[PDB]
Symmetry: C4
Subunit: 267 residues, 4 copies
């Protein structure tokens, strides 16, 4: 039986490193999104019976740890176009895989919503009485993509992602810094998981916990074709572009904050 | 006194590796079930006073860590017939111990319910007024075995275990993969504990947190003879077979998802 | 200034290993009790405003980790007369330090209540209106020592500690087993902290989280002389002796469960 | 592109070790305060909808872990003038950097409030209806700095910080003790994070979780000029000086408790 298993391994082997890493990014984001949006569905469809907002933070924080362990060796498990932007901005990785990773991250995050929707098919439909509504007392689209609260405005909503992404970049850069090793090597999976955990508890009130263009726009495109319709994009004065443009500008904002004070002054 | 202790060690020693590993599986599942169903009793019999649903997730997630530390070296602490099925499916372990482990896992999970029932004897009887009812406002049988919610249907209830088991297999396979080591070796106990933790927070709303045939059918057989009666099996249109057949088909569904994208493309 | 610090180090140095270890046990239990009973006061005096029962489990579980790190190298940080009983029962430690550790554990747990009482002096007095009552709607003595619930009886209350202590011993023995090392050495502090964490979430409903004669009877003697009076001992049909005699008989009950199935069958 | 990045690294390099460490302290406290006061804003401005008090403890506890990982190698990430006082008190560090670190810790904690205020600009203003009030049913200044509760008095409020700081010092000293290594080296970031976690759950009811002069007085100076006014300092009979003087006297109170019992009696 072992020979049969070994024979199948050599048949589907691909010698292309770029293609091998793109596949690991599709699975890395699929695990993160399915365990991320799946937890939000648990505390939204149950009206808080099966957990509060701390369940979302623990699940989102520890899903990054699992996604990194799954695909960390193959590609590094960036799981974030903003994170991939920072690595390419520091000459740590070529620019030719910036769109390759993004296409393999947006797709895979789109699949992560499909698994959640098929997992909560009856709960989602019966939440609002066989109808799908983007947001409100019976809103359902907020499970997959993040939406602003009532108090949020456009100007401050932009700066929530900029601050959230900048804090993530500074903490992530210190962990993945070769010259900064305050912990034994190999604990990158656990250390990053805490970073995403405290982000949800700290800055996860205005709109949610996106801090990633793929995790936000990925499942959002799924909800548009899943029954919610065009109302997904036009909610809150075209909110869809805020969690994409802002984190990209927040990635380079965490490089300037970190490198100018710790990264450059290291031996 | 040391000589007396050493003398007793040589008297009960068995040289059979297969028997030695089966005993470690009985204790591994007993610890997992007792700490798993014991936590559910805490938040059900107390009506949420002594904790919410996050207590169940933390206890279930960290009971696997303790059960692995107890029996990891002796047998590996599969604690799941679906997990044991995947290992035998990848030629990592002989097929002759698939029924041996299952018999030593179902038994041991049955004992894990007996310890919980004797631990909460007065609370269980006085929960519904000296009567035992399978489910409802005063239901008690839901502590040991998992039962579907009102919104759950048969078709989607089948796919909850398939999705839950597939996600577990992909994350577990990456951890126990010899060629995939993104973390220093020996942290298998901690990494697996997080996998079961996020499963409860993500997909623990429709029916509960079973994702294991032994943890579901094990204590369920105990409740049938403990006073609940035949109503345990026939609740929800013969729900008992769903958390057994589906995870078995979900174990091979996580092998195809993981190996075809990460496992095969590794050196 | 360094010479002055070095001079003071040699003045108070004691060459007695037994005395040096007893001092580390007084601090190990003081840290555990102060952080244990301090957390219970937070969720009792605030009526759940500043946390639920999960706060108690996290604080009690992670206080053992801190207490072990403080005194693990000096003496091992047993922090439990039942745990010390098991070690002496397996010839791992001489019987002459069983009463020495117990006296240094009960004292030190008594001090751990004094720090908490002085920390919450106004909250405790004003909780019931300048009066001290053992238990009830305004009870205060339940913060330090554990008391049975209304549903609890004498027979089952005895077996809660026996089951709770036996589960602790099996998990602790596997961690401290020289021949059972499923995790890299040195992680004893973290692994034990999870064991006490899941005990509170699983079997912390009937009476509380004692599973230790020193943590239960230690601060209980403090409450008797702190204003509560003789009502502390006579509550619930002389409940004071149950969390002392039962865990002692539960320590040898975890040795027989563990050694007969895993410990003896190891190389 | 790599040459351009390397050229910029050599341009802004400073060869002064004292200045390099001060910059790492500004970022270490900025990360701690922003993730600390940011979490308090989440559970205060949302009226508990987005989390309870356990969210504050988890975020405050794990922010110290992230701040240590960011600046641990550069300077050690004291993040606390009381902690820096203890190190200088044990001849482990020169006295000339006691005011340098404090100035680089108070500043940086002041910035940590500015990021939070800009992150929650609409929520803070609309919390009380376009008005800023120090404390009360609609109070807002309690997010940044800690304020006493109604039951708290002046005498016991002083001893809360003394007990809270002394417990922190004893646990921190044992971790950073070269002669006390019960855990493999390099886990200082994780072990310290648990110490601050249990402090919030244990002694975070009377006033809050300050146990640090920079985290308390830092953002408090920000609130005075941000609209709250002079009422910040004069609330609760000049409460501002209590969380500064008391922790300083509690730092030397943890040295005498720890060194006299464990630290001195070590080889
Ligand atoms: C809700 C949203 C959640 C968002 C979560 C975001 C998680 C971000 C995790 C960042 C992980 C970065 O991981 C880091 O990647 C870089 C990529 O060059 C790796 O870098 C290494 O490998 C790559 C190839 O993979 C080499 O080209 C490079 O020279 C080498 O240094 C690091 O070894 C790894 O530690
Ligand atoms: C609520 C339900 C909770 C469900 C929790 C399920 C937990 C699942 C844990 C899976 C643990 C698998 O653990 C993994 O087992 C395989 C079994 O071959 C071991 O494999 C190793 O040992 C076995 C013998 O034990 C050898 O035959 C094999 O060649 C060798 O590689 C791995 O070293 C171990 O890491
Ligand atoms: C709410 C209640 C909470 C209860 C928490 C209880 C915590 C229990 C922790 C148990 C720790 C045991 O720790 C274990 O102690 C034994 C004691 O012989 C040590 O054993 C070692 O040191 C001792 C001296 O210290 C030697 O005599 C012995 O030969 C050697 O093996 C182990 O190296 C240590 O790992
Ligand atoms: C809400 C408030 C939160 C408060 C949180 C407080 C966190 C406190 C963390 C304390 C960290 C101390 O960290 C410890 O610092 C000392 C400082 O000499 C370092 O000491 C080492 O480096 C320094 C230079 O940096 C040398 O001069 C010294 O000889 C050497 O031993 C230790 O290697 C480090 O482990």
């Amino acid at each position: 039986q072992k020979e049969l298993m070994n024979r199948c391994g050599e048949m589907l082997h691909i010698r292309y490193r770029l293609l091998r890493q793109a596949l690991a990014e599709c699975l890395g984001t699929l695990i993160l999104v399915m365990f991320g949006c799946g937890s939000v569905a648990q505390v939204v469809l149950s009206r808080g019976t099966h957990g509060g907002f701390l369940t979302i933070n623990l699940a989102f924080g520890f899903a990054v740890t699992l996604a990194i362990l799954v695909a960390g060796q193959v590609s590094g498990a960036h799981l974030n176009p903003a994170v991939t932007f920072a690595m390419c901005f520091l000459a740590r990785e070529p620019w030719i895989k910036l769109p390759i990773y993004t296409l393999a991250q947006t797709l895979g995050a789109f699949l992560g919503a499909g698994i959640v929707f098929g997992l909560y098919y009856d709960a989602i439909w019966a939440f609002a009485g066989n109808e799908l509504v983007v947001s409100g007392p019976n809103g359902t689209a907020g499970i997959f993509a993040t939406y602003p609260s009532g108090h949020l405005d456009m100007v401050n909503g932009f700066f929530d992602q900029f601050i959230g992404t900048a804090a993530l970049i500074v903490c992530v850069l210190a962990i993945v810094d070769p010259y900064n090793n305050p912990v034994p090597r190999g604990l990158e999976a656990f250390t990053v998981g805490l970073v995403v955990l405290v982000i949800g508890t700290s800055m996860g009130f205005n709109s949610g916990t996106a801090v990633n263009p793929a995790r936000d726009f990925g499942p959002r495109l799924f909800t548009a074709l899943a029954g919610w319709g065009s109302e997904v994009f036009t909610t809150g004065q075209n909110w869809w572009w805020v969690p994409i443009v802002s984190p990209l500008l927040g990635s380079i904002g965490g490089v300037f904050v970190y490198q100018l004070m710790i990264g450059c002054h290291l031996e």
